[PDB]
C-alpha cells in the first residue's frame, strides 16, 4: 500500500 | 525529481474505529512520517487546529490530501511511541525521567494554550516520543479553540477520558479549559511516577478520589510518590478549578525547579 504527497 | 511524492506504508502504528495511522517511507529520501487516514463514510476541524501548530513539544502538521471519500493527513512522526510505554506497571519510572518529560509537557501546554487550543484528551497514551525521547503532543481530535480575538469561551462539552478528566467537567455545566488540561497533567505525572491511575473518575462516589480529598496520602499510588513531587501533586489535583495552580505557578513549584536529571 501507498499514497502520494 | 520523480518519485519524491511517493509514499510507501510500512507499517499500522494505531488503528480504532474513525480509521488507521500508518508509518509511511518517502520513495526516495526514506524520510518516516505518519499518515492519518480517514474514510469520510470532525476532520475538517482537526486539520484547522493542525494547520496554527508550530512547536517543538507538539506533533507538526505537513499537510493533508483526500481522495473522494478518504482524507490523509501527514504528520511528524514519533519512532520513540507512546509515552505510555514508558511507564512501568505499579512502578512508575526513574524521578528525574519523569521530571524531564513533565518539563517538556508543560511547554507543549503551555504554547497551546498561549494560541487558545485546548488539547482536552491529554493521556500517556497521546504523548508520544522520538528518537530522542523528546515529548510529543498528539491528536488533536477533540482539541477546539477556547479563546479567539483574545475572548475566552467557557467549555460544556464533556470530553477526554474519565481517569484524566477533571471533577468540574463532570460536576458543572461550564467550565475554563486551561484548569482541565492541567489536572489532565496532574494524572499524567502521577502515573509517570507511580504507575498507576488513582481513581476511574473523579467523583465523590468514588472512594479512591474520597481518601485523596481526605489527605489519605499514606495509600497508593500517593506513598510511592516522593514528597517533593506530591506537594506539586497536592496543588495540581485540586477540586476547585479556580483554586487550581496555573501553569505559571507550576513553573515556580520547587519539585518542578529541583536538579535531578543529567543531560543526555
Ligand atoms: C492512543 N495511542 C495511539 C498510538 C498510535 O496511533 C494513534 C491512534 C494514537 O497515538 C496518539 N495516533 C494518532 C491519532 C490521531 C492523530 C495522530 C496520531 C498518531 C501519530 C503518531 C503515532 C505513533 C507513533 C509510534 C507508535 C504509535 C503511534 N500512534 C500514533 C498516532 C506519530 O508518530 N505521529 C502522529 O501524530
Known amino acids: 500500500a501507498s499514497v502520494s504527497a | ?264
Not at chain 2, 521530571?99 to 517538556?104: D, I, L, T
Not at chain 2, 516520543?129 to 467549555?155: H, M, P, Q, W
Not at chain 2, 502515573?191 to 462516589?205: I, V
Open chain 2, 1 to 264: 525529481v520523480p518519485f519524491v511524492e511517493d509514499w510507501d506504508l510500512v507499517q499500522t502504528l494505531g488503528e480504532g474505529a474513525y480509521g488507521e495511522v500508518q508509518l509511511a517511507v518517502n520513495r526516495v529520501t526514506e524520510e518516516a512520517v505518519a499518515v492519518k487516514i480517514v474514510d469520510m463514510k470532525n476532520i475538517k476541524k482537526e486539520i484547522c487546529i493542525n494547520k496554527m501548530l508550530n512547536h517543538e513539544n507538539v506533533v507538526k502538521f505537513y499537510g493533508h490530501r483526500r481522495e473522494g471519500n478518504i482524507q490523509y493527513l501527514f504528520l511528524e512522526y514519533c519512532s520513540g511511541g507512546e509515552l505510555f510505554d514508558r511507564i512501568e506497571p505499579d512502578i512508575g519510572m526513574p524521578e528525574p525521567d519523569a521530571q524531564r518529560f513533565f518539563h517538556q509537557l508543560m511547554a507543549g501546554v503551555v504554547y497551546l494554550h498561549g494560541i487558545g487550543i485546548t488539547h482536552r484528551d491529554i493521556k500517556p497514551e497521546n504523548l508520544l516520543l522520538d528518537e530522542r525521547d523528546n515529548l510529543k503532543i498528539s491528536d488533536f481530535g477533540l482539541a477546539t479553540v477556547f479563546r479567539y480575538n483574545n475572548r475566552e469561551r467557557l467549555l460544556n462539552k464533556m470530553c477526554g477520558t474519565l481517569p484524566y478528566v477533571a471533577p468540574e467537567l463532570l460536576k458543572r455545566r461550564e467550565f475554563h479549559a486551561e484548569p482541565v488540561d492541567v489536572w489532565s497533567c496532574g494524572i499524567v505525572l502521577t502515573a509517570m511516577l507511580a504507575g498507576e491511575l488513582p481513581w476511574d473518575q473523579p467523583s465523590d462516589s468514588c472512594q479512591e478520589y474520597s481518601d485523596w480529598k481526605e489527605k489519605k496520602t499514606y495509600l497508593n499510588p500517593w506513598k510511592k510518590i516522593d514528597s517533593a513531587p506530591l506537594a506539586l501533586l497536592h496543588k495540581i489535583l485540586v477540586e476547585n478549578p479556580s483554586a487550581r495552580i496555573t501553569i505559571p505557578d507550576i513553573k515556580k513549584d520547587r519539585w518542578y525547579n529541583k536538579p535531578l536529571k543529567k543531560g543526555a
